Design a protein around this ligand. Sequence first.
Ligand SMILES: CC(=O)C1(C(=O)N[C@H](C(=O)N2C[C@H](O)C[C@H]2C(=O)NCc2ccc(-c3scnc3C)cc2)C(C)(C)C)CC1
Lengths: 142, 104, 87
Amino acid sequence: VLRSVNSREPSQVIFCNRSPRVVLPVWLNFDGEPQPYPTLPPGTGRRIHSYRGHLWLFRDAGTHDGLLVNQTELFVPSLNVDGQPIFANITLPVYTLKERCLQVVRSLVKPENYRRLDIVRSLYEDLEDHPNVQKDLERLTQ
Amino acid sequence: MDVFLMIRRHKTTIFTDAKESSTVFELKRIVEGILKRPPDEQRLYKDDQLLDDGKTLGECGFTSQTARPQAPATVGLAFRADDTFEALCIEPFSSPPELPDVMK
Amino acid sequence: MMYVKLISSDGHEFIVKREHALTSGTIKAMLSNEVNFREIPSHVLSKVCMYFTYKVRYTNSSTEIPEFPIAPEIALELLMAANFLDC
Ligand SMILES: CC(=O)C1(C(=O)N[C@H](C(=O)N2C[C@H](O)C[C@H]2C(=O)NCc2ccc(-c3scnc3C)cc2)C(C)(C)C)CC1
């Protein structure tokens, strides 16, 4: 269901990493498989060539945490008006306090030791259930 | 421009915000409405320095880029009982435990 | 403006706007004007109050968002509190 349309109509785009993370852009190809592209350092930008109807989303390249693009989940290049590119602003979301705590703990404890931490089993599961591009596509379909 | 604050006396802490252009006296009217003590029975401090009623919070060093939502600046509070003011006193927060072995 | 009092396990009393505290569904139920937390120390509950301010400020905003900061020392305890408060 979630896949780029093979439209063949060019669309120039600026990816702008207005986040503190290293950003990994992900193109959803014609069968819906997620295909990763070169990463952007924080505060940096790239003029790239994409196509109308093509699906993109964005992630932290190291932890796979999800980021937003123009205030939302998915980015689809539109028609270019007056020879001017489309701006794709990549930003941090307001993570819950729970999910932010989980990011920090994950970045301090090796996965083998999540089970030696003194917390309810319910949180051990939450830690091992780390962000993943496939899962989010299954969700976003529903 | 909004500045974000913790106003602190003894074991009391208030979270609120104010304009960079608002006055020390005006901040006391806020405290009055919350803790029920009028401005004349209040002293406010930046660290050890007593603040003048007519000065702005900007003049006194609370700016929109230092006094942030996720990391607000501290303003000290002291009350007067009868003739004389108490000395400024702010109870520290609790101390965290040692980092567990797995987090080292 | 309506405020509420959140009191930590060690006796510190934090006074925040009612609106900001209703971010937690747990706190909402404990009210429906003071609430005592027997398991949450002040070094954790002060950070919780700061997240309320941060959330209400940056939700629905086009100004770039800064990272909400958490020291390594207080992370495990803060996780446990966020889990209980559902925030
Ligand atoms: C004539 C084509 O090439 C068509 C097409 O859709 N081609 C796709 C294509 O060109 N794509 C898919 C996406 O729309 C993006 C575009 C592409 O791959 N562009 C090159 C490119 C290279 C690097 C970057 C990035 S991302 C971060 N930094 C850079 C330099 C961005 C784009 C591909 C099947 C070849 C992958 C059939 C129209």
